[PDB]
Amino acid sequence: SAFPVHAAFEKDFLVQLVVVDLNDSMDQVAEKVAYHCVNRRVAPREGVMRVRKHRSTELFPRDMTIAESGLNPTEVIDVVF
Amino acid sequence: SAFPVHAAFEKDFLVQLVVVDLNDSMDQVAEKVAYHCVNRRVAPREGVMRVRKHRSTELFPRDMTIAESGLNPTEVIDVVFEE
Amino acid sequence: SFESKKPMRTWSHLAEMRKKPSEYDIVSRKLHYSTNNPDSPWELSPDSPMNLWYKQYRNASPLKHDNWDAFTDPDQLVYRTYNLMQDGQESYVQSLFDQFNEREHDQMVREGWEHTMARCYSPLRYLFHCLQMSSAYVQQMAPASTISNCCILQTADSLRWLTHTAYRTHELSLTYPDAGLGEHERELWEKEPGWQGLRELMEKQLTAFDWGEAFVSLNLVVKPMIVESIFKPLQQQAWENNDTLLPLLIDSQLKDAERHSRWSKALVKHALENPDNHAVIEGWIEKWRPLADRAAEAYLSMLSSD
Amino acid sequence: SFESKKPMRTWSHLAEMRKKPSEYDIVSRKLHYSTNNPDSPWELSPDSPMNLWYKQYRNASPLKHDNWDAFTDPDQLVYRTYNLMQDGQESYVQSLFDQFNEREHDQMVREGWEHTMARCYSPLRYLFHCLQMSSAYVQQMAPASTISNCCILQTADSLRWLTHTAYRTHELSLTYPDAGLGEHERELWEKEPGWQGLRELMEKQLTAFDWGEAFVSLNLVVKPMIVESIFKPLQQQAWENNDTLLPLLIDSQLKDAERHSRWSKALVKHALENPDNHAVIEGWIEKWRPLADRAAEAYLSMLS
Amino acid sequence: AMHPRKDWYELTRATNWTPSYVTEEQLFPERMSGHMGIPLEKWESYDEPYKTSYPEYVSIQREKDAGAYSVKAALERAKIYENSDPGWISTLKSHYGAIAVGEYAAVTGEGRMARFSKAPGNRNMATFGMMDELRHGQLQLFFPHEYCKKDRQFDWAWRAYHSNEWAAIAAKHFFDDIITGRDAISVAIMLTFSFETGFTNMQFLGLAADAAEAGDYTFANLISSIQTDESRHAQQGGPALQLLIENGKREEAQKKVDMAIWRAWRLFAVLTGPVMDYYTPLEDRSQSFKEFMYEWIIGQFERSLIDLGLDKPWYWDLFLKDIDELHHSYHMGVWYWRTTAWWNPAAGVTPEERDWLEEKYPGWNKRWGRCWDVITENVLNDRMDLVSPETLPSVCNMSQIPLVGVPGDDWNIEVFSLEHNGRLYHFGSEVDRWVFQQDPVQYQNHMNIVDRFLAGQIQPMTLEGALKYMGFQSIEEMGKDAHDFAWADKCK
Amino acid sequence: AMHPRKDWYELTRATNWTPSYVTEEQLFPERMSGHMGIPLEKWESYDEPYKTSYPEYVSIQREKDAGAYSVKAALERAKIYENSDPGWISTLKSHYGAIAVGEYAAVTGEGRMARFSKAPGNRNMATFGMMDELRHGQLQLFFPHEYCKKDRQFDWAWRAYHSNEWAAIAAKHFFDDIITGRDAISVAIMLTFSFETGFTNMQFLGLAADAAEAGDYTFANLISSIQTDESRHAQQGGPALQLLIENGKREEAQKKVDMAIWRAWRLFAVLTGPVMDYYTPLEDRSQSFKEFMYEWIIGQFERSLIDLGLDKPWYWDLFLKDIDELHHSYHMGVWYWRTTAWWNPAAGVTPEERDWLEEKYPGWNKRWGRCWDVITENVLNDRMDLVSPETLPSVCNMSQIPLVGVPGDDWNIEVFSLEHNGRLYHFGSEVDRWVFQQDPVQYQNHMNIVDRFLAGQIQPMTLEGALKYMGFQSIEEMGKDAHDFAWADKC
Numbered sequence A: 001s002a003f004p005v006h007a008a009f010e011k012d013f014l015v016q017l018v019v020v021d022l023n024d025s026m027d028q029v030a031e032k033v034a035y036h037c038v039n040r041r042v043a044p045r046e047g048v049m050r051v052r053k054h055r056s057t058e059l060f061p062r063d064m065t066i067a068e069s070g071l072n073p074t075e076v077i078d079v080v081f
Numbered sequence B: 001s002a003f004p005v006h007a008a009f010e011k012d013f014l015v016q017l018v019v020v021d022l023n024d025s026m027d028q029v030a031e032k033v034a035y036h037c038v039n040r041r042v043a044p045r046e047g048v049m050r051v052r053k054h055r056s057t058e059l060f061p062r063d064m065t066i067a068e069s070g071l072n073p074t075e076v077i078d079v080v081f082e083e
Numbered sequence C: 001s002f003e004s005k006k007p008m009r010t011w012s013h014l015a016e017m018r019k020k021p022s023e024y025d026i027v028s029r030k031l032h033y034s035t036n037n038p039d040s041p042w043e044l045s046p047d048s049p050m051n052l053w054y055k056q057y058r059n060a061s062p063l064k065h066d067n068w069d070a071f072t073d074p075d076q077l078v079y080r081t082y083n084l085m086q087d088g089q090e091s092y093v094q095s096l097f098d099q100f101n102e103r104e105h106d107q108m109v110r111e112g113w114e115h116t117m118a119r120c121y122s123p124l125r126y127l128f129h130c131l132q133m134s135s136a137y138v139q140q141m142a143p144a145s146t147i148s149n150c151c152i153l154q155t156a157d158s159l160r161w162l163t164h165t166a167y168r169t170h171e172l173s174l175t176y177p178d179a180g181l182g183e184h185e186r187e188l189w190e191k192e193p194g195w196q197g198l199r200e201l202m203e204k205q206l207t208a209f210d211w212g213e214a215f216v217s218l219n220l221v222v223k224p225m226i227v228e229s230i231f232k233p234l235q236q237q238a239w240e241n242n243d244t245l246l247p248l249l250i251d252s253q254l255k256d257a258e259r260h261s262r263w264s265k266a267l268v269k270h271a272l273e274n275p276d277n278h279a280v281i282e283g284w285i286e287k288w289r290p291l292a293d294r295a296a297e298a299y300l301s302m303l304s305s306d
Numbered sequence D: 001s002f003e004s005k006k007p008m009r010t011w012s013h014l015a016e017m018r019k020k021p022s023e024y025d026i027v028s029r030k031l032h033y034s035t036n037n038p039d040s041p042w043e044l045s046p047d048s049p050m051n052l053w054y055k056q057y058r059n060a061s062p063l064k065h066d067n068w069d070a071f072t073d074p075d076q077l078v079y080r081t082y083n084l085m086q087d088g089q090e091s092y093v094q095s096l097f098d099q100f101n102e103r104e105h106d107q108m109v110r111e112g113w114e115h116t117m118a119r120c121y122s123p124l125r126y127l128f129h130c131l132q133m134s135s136a137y138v139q140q141m142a143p144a145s146t147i148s149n150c151c152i153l154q155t156a157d158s159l160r161w162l163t164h165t166a167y168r169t170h171e172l173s174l175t176y177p178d179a180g181l182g183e184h185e186r187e188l189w190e191k192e193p194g195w196q197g198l199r200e201l202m203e204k205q206l207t208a209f210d211w212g213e214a215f216v217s218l219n220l221v222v223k224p225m226i227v228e229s230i231f232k233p234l235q236q237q238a239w240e241n242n243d244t245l246l247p248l249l250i251d252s253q254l255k256d257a258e259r260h261s262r263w264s265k266a267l268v269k270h271a272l273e274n275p276d277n278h279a280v281i282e283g284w285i286e287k288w289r290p291l292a293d294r295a296a297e298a299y300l301s302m303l304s
Numbered sequence E: 001a002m003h004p005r006k007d008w009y010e011l012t013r014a015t016n017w018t019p020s021y022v023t024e025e026q027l028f029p030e031r032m033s034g035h036m037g038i039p040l041e042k043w044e045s046y047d048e049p050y051k052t053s054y055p056e057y058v059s060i061q062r063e064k065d066a067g068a069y070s071v072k073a074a075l076e077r078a079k080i081y082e083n084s085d086p087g088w089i090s091t092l093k094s095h096y097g098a099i100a101v102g103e104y105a106a107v108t109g110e111g112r113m114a115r116f117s118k119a120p121g122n123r124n125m126a127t128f129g130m131m132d133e134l135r136h137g138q139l140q141l142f143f144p145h146e147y148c149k150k151d152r153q154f155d156w157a158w159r160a161y162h163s164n165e166w167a168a169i170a171a172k173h174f175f176d177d178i179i180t181g182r183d184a185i186s187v188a189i190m191l192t193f194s195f196e197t198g199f200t201n202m203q204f205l206g207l208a209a210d211a212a213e214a215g216d217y218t219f220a221n222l223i224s225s226i227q228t229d230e231s232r233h234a235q236q237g238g239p240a241l242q243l244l245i246e247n248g249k250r251e252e253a254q255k256k257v258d259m260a261i262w263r264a265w266r267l268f269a270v271l272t273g274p275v276m277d278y279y280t281p282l283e284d285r286s287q288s289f290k291e292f293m294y295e296w297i298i299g300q301f302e303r304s305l306i307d308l309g310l311d312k313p314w315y316w317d318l319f320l321k322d323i324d325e326l327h328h329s330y331h332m333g334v335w336y337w338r339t340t341a342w343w344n345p346a347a348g349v350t351p352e353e354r355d356w357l358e359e360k361y362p363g364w365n366k367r368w369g370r371c372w373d374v375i376t377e378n379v380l381n382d383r384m385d386l387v388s389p390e391t392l393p394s395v396c397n398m399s400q401i402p403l404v405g406v407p408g409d410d411w412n413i414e415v416f417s418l419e420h421n422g423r424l425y426h427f428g429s430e431v432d433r434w435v436f437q438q439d440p441v442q443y444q445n446h447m448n449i450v451d452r453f454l455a456g457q458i459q460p461m462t463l464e465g466a467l468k469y470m471g472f473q474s475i476e477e478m479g480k481d482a483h484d485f486a487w488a489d490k491c492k
Numbered sequence F: 001a002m003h004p005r006k007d008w009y010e011l012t013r014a015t016n017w018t019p020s021y022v023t024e025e026q027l028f029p030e031r032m033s034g035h036m037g038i039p040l041e042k043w044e045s046y047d048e049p050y051k052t053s054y055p056e057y058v059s060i061q062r063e064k065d066a067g068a069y070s071v072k073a074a075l076e077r078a079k080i081y082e083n084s085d086p087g088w089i090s091t092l093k094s095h096y097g098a099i100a101v102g103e104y105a106a107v108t109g110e111g112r113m114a115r116f117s118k119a120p121g122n123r124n125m126a127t128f129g130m131m132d133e134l135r136h137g138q139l140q141l142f143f144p145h146e147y148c149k150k151d152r153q154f155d156w157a158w159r160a161y162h163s164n165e166w167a168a169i170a171a172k173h174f175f176d177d178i179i180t181g182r183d184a185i186s187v188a189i190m191l192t193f194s195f196e197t198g199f200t201n202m203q204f205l206g207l208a209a210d211a212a213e214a215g216d217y218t219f220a221n222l223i224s225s226i227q228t229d230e231s232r233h234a235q236q237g238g239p240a241l242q243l244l245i246e247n248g249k250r251e252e253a254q255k256k257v258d259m260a261i262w263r264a265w266r267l268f269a270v271l272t273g274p275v276m277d278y279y280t281p282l283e284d285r286s287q288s289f290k291e292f293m294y295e296w297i298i299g300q301f302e303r304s305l306i307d308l309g310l311d312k313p314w315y316w317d318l319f320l321k322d323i324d325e326l327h328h329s330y331h332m333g334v335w336y337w338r339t340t341a342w343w344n345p346a347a348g349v350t351p352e353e354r355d356w357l358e359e360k361y362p363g364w365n366k367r368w369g370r371c372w373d374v375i376t377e378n379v380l381n382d383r384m385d386l387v388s389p390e391t392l393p394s395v396c397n398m399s400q401i402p403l404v405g406v407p408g409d410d411w412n413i414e415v416f417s418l419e420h421n422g423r424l425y426h427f428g429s430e431v432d433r434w435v436f437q438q439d440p441v442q443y444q445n446h447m448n449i450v451d452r453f454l455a456g457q458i459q460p461m462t463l464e465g466a467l468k469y470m471g472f473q474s475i476e477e478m479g480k481d482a483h484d485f486a487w488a489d490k491c
């Protein structure tokens, strides 16, 4: 249930491959993306990290899992505050 | 009587025609050249003005006249500050 | 002594006599600044080689007028209107070329006509280029921009005729590959008796450096002879030998030639405002006519041989 | 699990081979990266049109070898040494033309020879341009850069011969303007019987797209025939017609042609390390030989 | 006496004829020739503007090589590798790796035209083009070969095109598309007009000048000499374009120019953008990459297209915006993932350099500067772990270069995706997706490095695994910071 | 069917023949032809690279004018004169006056080649050249004519070449030297290769883009259209140079290129240098004049010369130094003596402009800035007497432009003088003196404006007297500050 997404983190300069888990919540997905961005090229911030479909106006709920979100492998997401 | 020289004044950007007199001393020549430069394109400053053949190392004596100097009409002079 | 003055509606040189001049006057009139200073036509040493040339060959011409700049092309052509007119004429000719080719016209001319063309038509490229060279000379030497402009356009027309001739020499060679078309024109121009009157005429005319003598010899003697003794007889021979294309092509070229005659006649009329110029022009015509007459006669004997 | 290694004194691919790499090896060897991935010659969709072309006409050629890249030009020519050599030959040709022209050579050929030249020599520009096109095809398809380099230089040499022929056609026409020189060559190549064997041969050869067949047909069949049946017979007839220029010009061209033969034979030798290739090469020679024989016969009947 | 070229030249290109034993289409198949149905006769009006002949070519090119090699030999002792700025050495490594074997590949593009173009003049010029590119390929192997013994990274002058390293794949994907992968007329347009005349001509001129400034006269002379060959074969696309336009193919011609310029741009931005704005010492910078792009490259394209009666490509405004942004992010990526490059990228973000970047690109510090602040802070705290990557960037399915945007306080990143024949593709711009859609059969089943990683072709699925797959053979070969982080001392 | 041009083109230039009734030298006299003794046969090797023919010419040129004139007519009421920056209006005035009647003069340079060149291809291309320059002269008279009724300074589009105004004499002395006053081969080399290919091509491209930025789409379109004609005739000098080189005349070829480039440079620096660096609004400057020269003129010359087997001129070092300095002094002079210009020069020395100048030319403020400081202070104190001249500048006997140097803290000025045939001449550079010495008979008896003033040719011997001599007819025509000193308010 390894699940590849392409993730763009807010204020970073690129989109990156991040392999998450089919059963990860959006919170868990955001932490996995954050690992490859925050304190690497993006300053740490207070507040809640949220996930969305790339350039969408709607956020996935924090405890929705990848499996139930409707996302498909290799689709692009943003992680934003 | 009229004597034309081409004169380059210290710190100015060009050489100008300046019509002076055969009996003008070099001091008088320097003043006539300065008239067309100082307070026009060149800041006023203290100091003796001296005259010389263009780019020459030797100066004309201050009281020597155009006639006395051996300069010929339309020759080029510099007007520069002492030393 | 300097006063305030209102803007002028046209150029200061025209602003007394006009409010809104023609396009022609606006763009053509009084542009030879080189005529302003009789000691230094050009802004160089008064005795530079080109200044000496212009003082002798333009300014000192016996053809004399105190107001050359007032000459007006009777057609009042400018660059823009010339190209409109000539693009039309070239649409005409190029369409003729295309259509006659499609019919294989050249195949159907009378036996032997290809040898007459190779001998009497294709070497015209030399004659026409001479006219081109000569026209450009009158251009550069004429004492008014309005005269020079007529010469520019005449130079272009001369190149037009040279180009028609190159195109047709090649084309004709495709049907008659054994006639020497495109191969022997220079040797004919240099060596064939029928070309020697014309070649002597042009070599000598091209060394008449006085602007007035150049203009009279070229436009009042050479070119009208070419109309009467080359173009028209070639046209007649063509019809007689079942070449329908040549006569039509020549009528288009004759339209250019008639235009050259028109502006030349106008310049003569202007010059004759000074009655002294009558003897000058007549003198130069009498001087050059015998050479043009020999040239015509020799060409015509060659054209009509066999 | 990456190790520290010292710098190598040559390219990693040459570093093992006992011998020190020559200029030739350094600049010529193993440059066709398009042979690395069998199913995707080029870095595109594996089934892009050009990938399918190469998989069919290069990779799938019945002429086979595990190491085409190991082929070596016996003359070991690179761009630099090719131009040194050919500049010398073009200086020779320049002085030949210049000096022969000065003594009015062309005026002194036997009567009528200009007509033989217009018929049998000047249309050679079409034949030579066909060789040029064909050599460029072998260049772009060959499975090793060392093979391709020989082809590049052969392409240039073909253009060289085309250029000689154009120059001499024009030059000859200056003395003989009524022979159709520079005027009737396309028509002759298209319609004259003596040229049709050669034209059919080249039109067919230019549509042989397998790299191996293209090489065999061009270099082992077409080009040797041109040496034996065109170049040499033209020399013989020129001498008999007091044309001393043509045989000397052809001499320099034959030097090029012998070079092409040398590298071709070297490639056959390399190919033959795989004994299966003997029957394949032989098959292609026997297939193309009848057309080449017909081309030569028709040309020689025209020449005589 | 000898006769002037003008009098016999036409005979050297009087080589078209009407095939009888095979058909015209069999002799010049559309897929290899690209004639778009335009009949043979039309192509005979193709007129190369800069003519030459075999004797002149061999003579002048002999002189050129005599010089190039003599200069190289005479300067052997100058110790360029030891004495040059690290930035210059990385520029050499990057240049030779990206270019040398690509020059040799261009022989194949030229040969494609020599055989398959219906224009006689094109076929002859392409033959000289084959020779030119052969020269350039050999020169640019012979010269860097000298540095093999000093540094394994110089092995990549030969090795890059034989590897699956990311920049090598980007270069091969581009060059295989415009040079070796298409018909003769496409090559004329996309290689000689769009890439050579449009980019490399001015790039080589600039490079030769930069070389002299770096005190490397062997390379300055080499590049300058190579550039003098360019017009001889680069001139070929111009007349081909004119002919297409005259024969009702303006839109087909435009499309090919459109596609080629953008593809060249993306590669140009990753390989040369960072060199100009970051690797070159500050005191030797005389215009920014943007100024170069806008004034030299874009300016000459506008003038050249107009003169041909073509239009500015549809994406021109996108291009104008890209030149302000793209290469800054590309540089940041190349540096952060430096371990995957065969050269050593220079960070180029000391305070003085950042002042220059800010002057040349107002707002730079509030954008890329934000990322560099975090990186810089980590270097100053010896948090080396945080300046090394632990995943792959997402990669464009066209350019083969990572999907980037503008970072920091003006964050904007857009991926342009496509579902095509049951597969999901991602592109780094609207133009890149559009290129894909113009010719899907060229591109559809290609797998970029990430696609391969996800497909299981790269094992282990780790950094070491990717590095091995990319063809690295020792720890020294992997890119590092050009100055081993010396720059950080200037940042406080 | 029509036969393609390549099949018959050669016949259009198979027009040389061996004269028998006059000698070759009589038909092509050296002074007009410039063949340098090279026999007719050799000239047949001349090959113009970009071919065209009469029917193609009239067809395409007809379309070009249809466009140009229609655009002008459609923008008639766009109020360009009233709405443009005064800096742009002065750019137009300066361009039309310096160029319009010079373009017409170029018909004569082309005509010289059409009659007197020994190369047949040259004679034909020169014929198209006569036509092209006729077009250009007529366009550049017709276009500015519209503005006469608005502003007397636009009269100078016609008047300048008919005047003794200083810049008009500088222009005519140059153009008469390289266009109308020399043999056919010198024209090919000095006009078509050095001036047209080497300067005007890039200048016209830059000017058209500048016009568009200024919102003058009529002029932008005009200048663009004219520039498309350039290559047709500008191509003529390259092949001429190759021919001289092949025939043992490389030394003479080089010398003619060296002369023309330097003479073009001095004129270019006085008339266009100030436009780019001072007249153009600051926000619209993308390169300095030095950057333009270095990146678009110099390198192009070096590459083209090498390509032909020629070398960088001997003075190349001096040229590179001149690009840093010359036009800053030239501008200062044009502005200080603005009353003698037919356009209104913009000072271009607000603090913001001065910062840009300093960036583009380090040291500018301690050099030219020192002079502008005094001028600026006088302007603020309404000392209009001290920003108006009471004498003549000293003038170069070659370029007809004032003798200048570097002012301020780094004062350096040098006059290069010559005693020749009993007369003393002064030159603004080592190169200008050298040019004079290459062909003294071209120049030796020419009198510059100062020479004439001193010979009593200009009366009264006053500013008013000089202005009258220079052809001014009203107070409105005399050059003034472009912005009526509005810039001082930012100081």
Ligand SMILES: Oc1ccc(Br)cc1
Pocket: D090, D093, D094, D097, D098, D163, D164, D167, E002, E003, E054, E055
């Ligand atoms: O290949 C050639 C060499 C010299 C001359 Br002359 C002509 C052609």
Ligand SMILES: Oc1ccc(Br)cc1
Pocket: E098, E099, E102, E103, E106, E133, E175, E196, E200
């Ligand atoms: O001329 C060139 C051809 C191909 C490349 Br890659 C670079 C330059």
Ligand SMILES: Oc1ccc(Br)cc1
Pocket: E095, E098, E099, E199, E200, E203, E264, E267, E268, E271, E272
């Ligand atoms: O040196 C170069 C590197 C990449 C490109 Br794309 C062009 C030139």
Ligand SMILES: Oc1ccc(Br)cc1
Pocket: A014, E166, E329, E330, E331, E332, E333, E334, E337, E338, E340, E393, E401, E402, E403, E404
């Ligand atoms: O290796 C890389 C190259 C470019 C970017 Br952007 C990211 C990574």
Ligand SMILES: Oc1ccc(Br)cc1
Pocket: E337, E340, E389, E390, E391, E392, E393, E461, E462, E463, E464, E466
């Ligand atoms: O697991 C991986 C880490 C870094 C890269 Br780059 C590739 C794979």
Ligand SMILES: Oc1ccc(Br)cc1
Pocket: F098, F099, F102, F103, F106, F133, F175, F196, F200
């Ligand atoms: O083409 C031109 C000719 C002469 C001048 Br002046 C300007 C342009």
Ligand SMILES: Oc1ccc(Br)cc1
Pocket: F094, F095, F098, F099, F203, F264, F267, F268, F271, F272
């Ligand atoms: O407007 C111009 C003035 C002088 C020159 Br030189 C070129 C253009």
Ligand SMILES: Oc1ccc(Br)cc1
Pocket: B014, F166, F329, F330, F331, F332, F333, F334, F337, F338, F340, F393, F401, F402, F403, F404
């Ligand atoms: O009128 C002038 C023009 C230029 C200078 Br410098 C001085 C005066």
Ligand SMILES: Oc1ccc(Br)cc1
Pocket: F337, F340, F389, F390, F391, F392, F393, F461, F462, F463, F464, F466
């Ligand atoms: O007396 C004069 C004053 C100024 C000039 Br400018 C000319 C004459």
Ligand SMILES: [Ca+2]
Pocket: B063, B065
């Ligand atoms: Ca006393």
Ligand SMILES: [Ca+2]
Pocket: B066, B067, B068, B069, B070, B071
């Ligand atoms: Ca005395």
Ligand SMILES: [Ca+2]
Pocket: C029, C030, C031, C032, C033, C069, C143, C144, C145, C146
């Ligand atoms: Ca007049």
Ligand SMILES: [Ca+2]
Pocket: C035, C036, C069
């Ligand atoms: Ca008068």
Ligand SMILES: [Ca+2]
Pocket: C046, C047
């Ligand atoms: Ca006299």
Ligand SMILES: [Ca+2]
Pocket: C066, C067, C068, C069, C070
């Ligand atoms: Ca009058």
Ligand SMILES: [Ca+2]
Pocket: C101, C102, C103, C104
């Ligand atoms: Ca028919």
